[PDB]
């Protein structure tokens, strides 16, 4: 009953498909016990990268404040629209509300979405898009919600506004998003001014915190043991056992556990990557790219031309030094970081020195 060393990550079991295109995360990043109102996460779309030629954050370096080449995902963040701020409190059973406080006017892309009109799946009943529901009487009793003592974290059901980013569809992408803030009272009080229609981007993301890069990754294949775990080939490479593996079980006992080196789905969950440090926030048009060299390929920010398989960016973006899962077209969900490691390098803006602009190709 031996062991051979840990080639590949064990605990992505089961390797379940992330059906919904936007990433979810049950364990949300807990409160900013500093900022009086925030959100927990936000929204993005994966677009492309640039080489930010700047200078180091770590100030005591041997080559301190030199020229530094760096990755950056420049993800488009249009602000999300509220349907209603749901006032989750407690009861003596559990995490149960009392009322929501609706928004009056929603967006336009609420037409096609609020349903589950898809084949081999359940509906919803005729809870369609909004008429004019509970907000008038509901807005005052969320004050009385904290007076219960039985009171929990108040949240807000949101939807996107799409075309603004170059993707042309008008059926919105849904999610609930938790409201953070100072205390339970404050994430209710200041969130009354949030449900009006649209929220702020800058409430959750302060410039130069960190931002944990969760999104939905690509489904690579039905990947075998070589790529999915990390086995080799045998150098004889004949017969049956080329890209196979050896042991799955063991003689004594016959019954093993969930470590075994088999084939199946790779990637494609709502997989969480850790503290990618936020570079800058730029609202409109600032940085460019497009340089005629081989580096890595096919995602170009305002060159001569545009991006391939996305569209040219004329919106409002947030720049994360690092990355975030998906590929082109894929809609992402940027969660914030609860444990912010390094000291916040805010107040002033971070350096942009110069950047190229030409073709990307020949």
């Amino acid at each position: 009953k031996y062991e051979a060393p840990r080639h590949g990550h064990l605990g992505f079991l089961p390797r379940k498909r992330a059906a919904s295109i936007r990433a979810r995360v049950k364990a949300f990043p807990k409160d900013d016990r500093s900022k009086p109102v925030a959100l927990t996460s936000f929204l993005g779309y994966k677009a492309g990268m640039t080489t930010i030629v700047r200078d180091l954050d770590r100030p005591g370096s041997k080559f301190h404040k030199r020229e530094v080449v760096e990755a950056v995902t420049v993800v488009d963040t249009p602000p999300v629209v509220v349907v209603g701020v749901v006032g989750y409190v407690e009861t003596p059973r559990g995490l149960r509300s009392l009322t929501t406080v609706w928004a009056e006017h929603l967006s336009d892309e609420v037409k096609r979405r609020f349903y589950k009109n898809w084949y081999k799946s359940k509906k919803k009943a005729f809870t369609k898009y909004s008429a004019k529901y509970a907000q008038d009487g509901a807005g005052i009793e969320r004050e009385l919600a904290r007076i219960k003592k039985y009171a929990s974290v108040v949240r807000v059901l949101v939807h996107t506004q799409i075309r603004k980013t170059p993707l042309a569809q008008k059926k919105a992408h849904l999610a609930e998003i938790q409201l953070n803030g100072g205390s339970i009272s404050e994430k209710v009080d200041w969130a009354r001014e949030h449900f009006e229609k649209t929220v702020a981007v800058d409430s959750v993301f302060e410039q130069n915190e960190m931002i944990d890069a969760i999104a939905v990754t690509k489904g690579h294949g039905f990947e075998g043991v070589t790529h999915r775990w990390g086995t080799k080939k045998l150098p004889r490479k004949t017969h049956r056992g080329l890209r196979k593996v050896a042991c799955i079980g063991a003689w004594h006992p016959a019954h093993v556990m969930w470590s075994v080196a088999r084939a199946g789905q790779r990637g494609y969950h709502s997989r969480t990557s850790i503290n990618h440090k936020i570079y800058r926030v730029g609202k409109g048009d600032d940085e460019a790219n497009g340089a005629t060299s081989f580096d890595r390929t096919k995602k170009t920010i305002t060159p001569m031309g545009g991006f391939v398989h996305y569209g040219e960016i004329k919106n409002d973006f947030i720049m994360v030094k690092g990355c975030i899962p998906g590929n082109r077209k894929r809609i992402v969900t940027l969660r914030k970081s609860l444990y912010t490691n390094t000291s916040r390098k805010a107040l002033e803006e971070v350096s942009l020195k110069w950047i190229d602009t030409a073709s990307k190709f020949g």
Binding site: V53, E67, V69, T292, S293, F294, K353, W354, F361, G362
Partner: protein, 45 residues
């Protein structure tokens, strides 16, 4: 290969020899270092 414009913080340099400084510039021009295509025909380079 070509006689384009190198940036201050970009550009691969080959120093094959007694430090014979060459460089790439364009992608299409890096290619003309395999094939050895001379700047006689190709005019824009």
């Amino acid at each position: 290969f070509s006689g384009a414009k190198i940036y201050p913080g970009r550009g691969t340099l080959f120093v094959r020899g007694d430090s014979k400084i060459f460089r790439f510039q364009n992608s299409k021009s890096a290619s003309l270092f395999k094939q050895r295509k001379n700047p006689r025909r190709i005019a824009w380079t």
